[PDB]
Structure formats: C-alpha cells, structure tokens
C-alpha cells in the first residue's frame with residue numbers, strides 16, 4: 001500500500017496473509033485474502049495461477065506483521081484451492097480474478113473467533129455503495145517504488161469508489177473494465193494498492209457492518225494519476241461463492 005498508515009490486525013481482523021512454503025522452513029509472502037467463513041478465505045486467482053498446487057501454501061489469520069509473530073495468530077494449510085475456471089488475463093486486466101481457499105489448521109480445525117480474527121460480511125447481490133463512498137484496503141504490499149523490502153507492519157488506506165462509467169472513459173481504462181470489476185482511487189492519487197496487495201480486501205462499512213465489496217486485482221502502476229486500482233466486484237460472484245462453499 002502506497003500512502004496510508006500502519007495498522008494492526010485488531011483493526012482489520014478478517015485479513016488473511018497467504019505465503020508459499022519452501023524446503024527448509026522458509027516462506028515467501030504471496031498475497032492477501034479475507035476470511036468470509038470459519039473455513040473459507042477468499043483471494044484472487046492470479047496470485048496462484050502459476051503455482052496452483054494447494055500443498056505449497058500457508059495462510060495466517062490474526063497476523064499484524066509480515067516476518068514476525070503476533071500474539072494470537074493462527075496458521076492454516078490449504079485443503080482446497082479453488083480458482084475460477086474462467087479466469088484469464090489480457091494485456092491490462094485480470095478477468096474473473098477470484099479464488100477460494102479452504103483452510104485447515106495443523107490440528108484439523110477451521111478459524112476460531114477472537115479480537116484479532118473475525119469474518120467480514122459478504123455484500124448482497126448487485127448491491128454496492130454508490131461512487132464517492134469511502135472504503136478501506138489493507139495489505140503487506142510495497143509502500144514505495146524504490147523499496148526492495150515490503151513493510152513489516154500491516155498497512156491500510158482509504159480510497160473512494162469510482163463509477164463504472166468514469167472508469168470506462170478512454171483516459172482511464174476504457175473497455176478494459178467490465179461490470180464485474182470496480183474501480184477505486186484517492187481523489188489526489190496519493191494512496192493506492194501496490195505489488196503484493198492483490199487478493200486483499202476492499203471493505204466498505206454499510207450500516208455499521210463491514211462488507212467485502214472488492215478484491216484487489218490490478219491497475220496501472222501504483223498511485224498513478226487517472227489509473228485507479230481495479231478490484232473484483234464481489235457482489236457479482238455471490239452465486240459462485242455460495243455454490244463452491
């Protein structure tokens with residue numbers, strides 16, 4: 001995340017950190033995700049498409065820091081990696097960029113609630129906030145283009161939803177964004193998702209309840225003028241989520 005502030009998992013208790021395992025016990029961060037039910041984390045397919053083997057991945061919940069431990073964190077294996085069968089990418093966009101990870105602890109249990117681990121609510125079908133609404137994104141992605149290190153502490157920022165008609169304008173993304181995507185940006189183009197933030201949640205507070213509205217998918221650069229972040233529009237995959245869960 002570019003711009004934005006350090007946060008703790010307490011403030012983002014549905015956030016899931018997804019890593020890939022390596023011989024020796026070392027791991028490398030992959031992508032973000034969100035806990036939508038005790039046994040299911042939702043993320044983006046493009047995070048896994050090159051290495052679709054569920055055995056290689058681990059998921060943390062209740063984790064505030066990238067390479068050190070947080071009190072109360074829970075570690076999980078992936079029982080089922082479900083990628084969208086119609087996922088694809090052209091020269092700019094990911095399509096149907098949504099994935100489900102069935103999680104299972106070493107001891108065989110799903111996630112348990114706590115101050116640092118909670119589910120986010122799913123949206124209602126075709127019901128999303130109107131453009132201009134503030135929503136938050138969270139992730140361990142890069143915060144600076146010249147960095148070789150990702151931030152050690154979780155970050156968040158606030159962006160505003162952009163209408164589909166604005167994002168489809170030629171100096172934005174044109175026909176590259178479909179009704180199955182949503183765009184969001186800082187009005188001053190100062191804060192944005194970046195490398196490593198994909199898979200993570202775009203959350204909007206609806207009537208008090210925090211709702212998973214988007215999943216970080218793609219864009220052009222990070223915090224570039226007239227190039228909003230593009231998210232998978234979760235309210236259009238509810239049937240897919242419901243049936244595969």
Ligand SMILES: CN(C)c1ccc(C(=O)O)c(Oc2nc(Oc3cccc(-c4cccc(CN)c4)c3)c(F)c(N3CC[C@@H](N(C)C)C3)c2F)c1
Nearest residue numbers: 030089092093094193194195196197198218219221222229
């Ligand atoms: C395999 N692993 C572990 C990972 C981990 C993280 C990411 C990620 O997206 O963050 C990832 O996907 C990808 N990672 C990239 O690196 C970067 C570099 C800089 C910014 C971003 C980036 C990521 C999310 C949102 C936004 C919008 N501000 C930007 C991604 C890519 F440029 C692509 N392209 C470039 C080509 C384009 N096209 C196929 C749509 C997609 C990509 F698909 C793979």
